[PDB]
Design a protein around this nucleic acid. Structure first.
Ligand SMILES: [Mg+2]
Ligand SMILES: [Mg+2]
Ligand SMILES: [Mg+2]
Ligand SMILES: [Mg+2]
Ligand SMILES: [Mg+2]
Ligand SMILES: [Mg+2]
Ligand SMILES: [Mg+2]
Ligand SMILES: [Mg+2]
Lengths: 185, 262, 131, 58, 141
RNA sequence: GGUGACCACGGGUGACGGGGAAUCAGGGUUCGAUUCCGGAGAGGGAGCCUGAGAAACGGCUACCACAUCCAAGGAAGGCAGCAGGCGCGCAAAUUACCCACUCCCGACCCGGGGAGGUAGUGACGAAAAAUAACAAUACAGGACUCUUUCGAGGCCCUGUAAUUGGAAUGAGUCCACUUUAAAUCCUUUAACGAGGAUCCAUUGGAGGGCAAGUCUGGUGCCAGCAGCCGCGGUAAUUCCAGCUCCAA
């Protein structure tokens, strides 16, 4: 019949118990620190970390010198150091278990533009990304959750068409200019 | 069903065709021919997906109907002709020739060959018998049967078909120390030298084959296609020389290639 | 025109259909997507050919504008364009006319011919009275 | 039946109908979370009141 | 104790499937008598026609009249009692209405002080009872 | 003679089988009508013609049950195909466009295909992601700092109200292009488009479990709430409301 795909998965897992003061406060601290929209962002990054830890645990229980352990562990370690959450020197499967959620959250584009200094606050960074002002390499990205890589860290900049790189000021600027010039002939 | 099937599903097609899921519901169900459909490569996907000459089935139909493809030296206008193992696809308008051979990862590779090598084709005999008037008949892995062969040729040996005549030029006996190739299973596409053949009467015999790296792998007898005498193949081998590399070595080979190019 | 450029990659020639395939990426920095006629005339300038045998299609503009990638096919002669091309690309340039009727009406007509047997006059006139 | 259905809806009928008062539109989404985070992780001041709740009616 | 032999799996499996009939959930879900006795017949909701508006006294420690409707289900024609769950929605209910009825919450069991009531009214005259209570939409007069 | 407590035989199944799905320490427990493979059926049975292949049903014959036309002599049926109705129900969409793609059939590069593709309805479900950001005044807070409480500013951070107060953008209108068989949508790009940015976020709760009010007003064992404990008989943190909070 149809040539559809219907292959999909949930990117987050809800907590087992709701209404714990400790968990609620900790997640709210993460949300406030990284300008997250709701608890689903922190839950999805928590779920990504949990999946990574699960794969690492499977490889750890797997015997050392096993070809599968070597291949998959090296692949996982190099992708972690590629996104920059793991240091270049700490390329061991044991240190994967030592990772937390904060170092994942600090690789998002929203936090990266604020840290690089293109934005005044984390929420200003999120809105600035969402209004298509920031480009990475040649491609303009409007997804705040864009996990940046180490090689792409340096190339974060403003988009050319934005009223922060090249010209063409915004509609409110142009309207104010034309109103000011129409007030004096 | 009340009769033979004439449709093939895209997801039910053989994996080595590299047919993706999204483009179509169906697959080009190969027409009946010399080779089985599970181990044949239809001309449509050969010219559309492997060489990227055509964009769709209509374009590849136009190429076929303008009579440029000579499979086994014969012009074949069938869009779903089963090419199969060790067949010559000659496009003389471009002056290019292809020997259909499995690569390392057990799937047919685009293998360009010279015109002076494209005029002969090795074949594995399948059954030998004697027809009417005491005439020795010999069938091959294709649907190709020949008469009056050399009595020295026994079953699962190799012969050299000379094209445009359908005759024998030379032959290879199947025995220990002869370079061969696996044509099915997990070891499909691997080049090695026969080292042992153990016999199980009433069952499939199993051969042990060692490649150039010394790696020993076993397979069934029916999956063995001898393609050379000793350690020298009778045809030009594909890239990689039929040497199976595990995931680590191809990973670091990719890394070395990218590092040299960058 | 001031800043609009064509670049060509994955280019190859096939005499099987006597044409040349390529994927062309256009670079319009601050403009809209460049129209297919402009693309064809610029490719004609690039490859020294009259700008009516060219065929370009499948143009996807990348996110945020700028680059736009499509497929280009340039023929050696204008005659082969009718010989081996889909009819819709010909109709876009106007070389082919598909001034035809509804598929549903064709099916109704075909079903009426099934009712009327044999007689040539009635088999061809069954579509006249129920117009 | 006991014939005592006549009281159905009594209190809701008797409750004086006071209307809602117009208020400033509440922020929603990321800004609501930002305000919520500031109200309990930025203005934190230790007090002898044993960390009164957000809805304290003192 | 229990057997542990290497080939006692038949006895272990037979004992499990024999003793699994001794807990109420498995018996209820695998005998079929509960499904036969269920007025909803294994459905989450069911439509019916209001026959009568009645009041049910609450249980002993409480003292109140719970407003319920006698309802004849359009499928299989069974009569049930459904609680009308809000402050004044019995006034929205009238005679001979197509009411949607759901379970009360704990799987064919009486809930709260209401004796023998297993169902509650979700919709009346094809308009939601919650909407009528909130005043979002009025009765179709 | 054969089969049976190593469960035959019989009965039930709200049983098509499998690849698989949900749950997710390990072990398991449920679900697999459903797009792939295999089987069966074309209202129920039964019997056949042709054909390589059918016990075919968009083939035929007969019976059983429904049901269409009729000049009453006859004749014609099989949507568990795509649409679309009725009926059943808690429960499921357009009597749309096209063979352009994937393939199939044919005497065949050319015709056909409700296979299939495309669009429509679509909060089944899954992914991403707006509903605001910033600056300066006030009044607070910080290890704030200057003299060692008193006053101020060489700083940092919230909240409340304001000609603030002028920057940024989509959501929408809409030129064109592009997509495409023709289109629609997305992506581009002109022109408008935000200060109650009234371009207005909801659904459930605030005794405990379980995050959040011993607030105010009504009712007074009534109305009602309450999955479970329980609340309600006159200052009810539990009902009905207003405000304020909480969760997503
Ligand atoms: Mg059944
Ligand atoms: Mg199944
Ligand atoms: Mg099937
Ligand atoms: Mg025939
Ligand atoms: Mg059948
Ligand atoms: Mg039949
Ligand atoms: Mg809104
Ligand atoms: Mg209240």
């Amino acid at each position: 019949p149809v040539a559809r795909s219907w292959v999909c998965r949930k990117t987050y897992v809800t907590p087992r118990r709701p209404f714990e003061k400790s968990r609620l406060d900790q997640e709210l601290k993460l949300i406030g620190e990284y300008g997250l929209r709701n608890k689903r962002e922190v839950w999805r990054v928590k779920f990504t970390l949990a999946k990574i830890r699960k794969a690492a645990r499977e490889l750890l229980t797997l015997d050392e010198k096993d070809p599968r352990r070597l291949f998959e562990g090296n692949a996982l370690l190099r992708r972690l150091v590629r996104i920059g959450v793991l240091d270049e020197g700490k390329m061991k499967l044991d240190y994967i278990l030592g990772l937390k959620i904060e170092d994942f959250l600090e690789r998002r584009l929203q936090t990266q533009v604020f840290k690089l200094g293109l934005a005044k606050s984390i929420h200003h960074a999120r809105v600035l990304i969402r209004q298509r002002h920031i480009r990475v390499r040649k491609q303009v990205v409007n997804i705040p959750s864009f996990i940046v890589r180490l090689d792409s860290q340096k190339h974060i900049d403003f988009s050319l068409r934005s009223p922060y790189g090249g010209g063409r000021p915004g509609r409110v600027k142009r309207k104010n200019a034309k109103k000011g010039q129409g007030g004096a002939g | 069903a009340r009769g033979p099937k004439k449709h093939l599903k895209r997801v039910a097609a053989p994996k080595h065709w590299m047919l993706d899921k999204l483009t179509g519901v169906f697959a080009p169900r190969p027409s009946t021919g010399p080779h089985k459909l599970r181990e044949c490569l239809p001309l449509i996907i050969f010219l559309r997906n492997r060489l990227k000459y055509a964009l769709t089935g209509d374009e590849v139909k136009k190429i076929c109907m303008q009579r440029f493809i000579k499979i086994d030296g014969k012009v074949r206008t069938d869009i779903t002709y089963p090419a199969g193992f060790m067949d010559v696809i000659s496009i003389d308008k471009t002056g290019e020739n292809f020997r259909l051979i499995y690569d390392t990862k057990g799937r047919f590779a685009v293998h360009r060959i010279t015109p002076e090598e494209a005029k002969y084709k090795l074949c594995k005999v399948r059954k030998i018998f004697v027809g009417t008037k005491g005439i020795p008949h010999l069938v091959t892995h294709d649907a190709r049967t020949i008469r009056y062969p050399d009595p020295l040729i026994k079953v699962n040996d190799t012969i050299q078909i000379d094209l445009e005549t359908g005759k024998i030029t030379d032959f290879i006996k199947f025995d220990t120390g002869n370079l061969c190739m696996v044509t099915g299973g997990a070891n499909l596409g691997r080049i090695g030298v026969i080292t042992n053949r153990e016999r199980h009467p009433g069952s499939f015999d199993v051969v042990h084959v060692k490649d150039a790296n010394g790696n020993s792998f076993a397979t069934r007898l029916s999956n063995i296609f001898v393609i050379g005498k000793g350690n020298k193949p009778w045809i030009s081998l594909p890239r990689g020389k039929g040497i199976r590399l595990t995931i680590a070595e191809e990973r670091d080979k990719r890394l070395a290639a990218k590092q040299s190019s960058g | 025109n001031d800043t609009v450029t064509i670049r060509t990659r994955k280019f190859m020639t096939n005499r099987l259909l006597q044409r040349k395939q390529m994927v062309i990426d256009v670079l319009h920095p601050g403009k809209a997507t460049v129209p297919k006629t402009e693309i064809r005339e610029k490719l004609a300038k690039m490859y020294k050919t009259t700008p009516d045998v060219i065929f370009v299609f499948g143009f996807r503009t990348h996110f945020g504008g700028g680059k736009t990638t499509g497929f280009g096919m340039i023929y050696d002669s204008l005659d082969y364009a009718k010989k081996n091309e889909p009819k819709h690309r010909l109709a876009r340039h106007g070389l082919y006319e598909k001034k035809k009727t509804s598929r549903k009406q064709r099916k109704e007509r075909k079903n009426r011919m099934k009712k009327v047997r044999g007689t040539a006059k009635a088999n061809v006139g069954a579509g006249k009275k129920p117009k | 039946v006991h014939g005592s259905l006549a009281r159905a809806g009594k209190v809701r009928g008797q409750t004086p109908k006071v209307a809602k008062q117009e208020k400033k539109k509440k922020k929603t989404g990321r800004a609501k979370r930002r305000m919520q985070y500031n109200r309990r992780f930025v203005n934190v001041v230790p007090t002898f009141g044993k960390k009164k709740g957000p809805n304290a009616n003192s | 104790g229990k057997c542990r032999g290497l080939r006692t799996a038949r006895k272990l499996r037979s004992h499990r499937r024999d003793q699994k009939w001794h807990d109420k959930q498995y018996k209820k879900a695998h005998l079929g008598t509960a499904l036969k006795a269920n007025p909803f017949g294994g459905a989450s909701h069911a439509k019916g026609i209001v026959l009568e508006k009645v009041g049910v006294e609450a249980k002993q420690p409480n003292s109140a009249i719970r407003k319920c409707v006698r309802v004849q289900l359009i499928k299989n024609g069974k009569k049930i009692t459904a609680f009308v769950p809000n402050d004044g929605c019995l006034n929205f209910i009238e005679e001979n209405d197509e009411v949607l009825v759901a379970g009360f919450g704990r799987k064919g069991h009486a809930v709260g002080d209401i004796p023998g009531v297993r169902f509650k009214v979700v919709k009346v005259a094809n308009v939601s009872l919650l909407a009528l209570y909130k005043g979002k939409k009025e009765r179709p007069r």
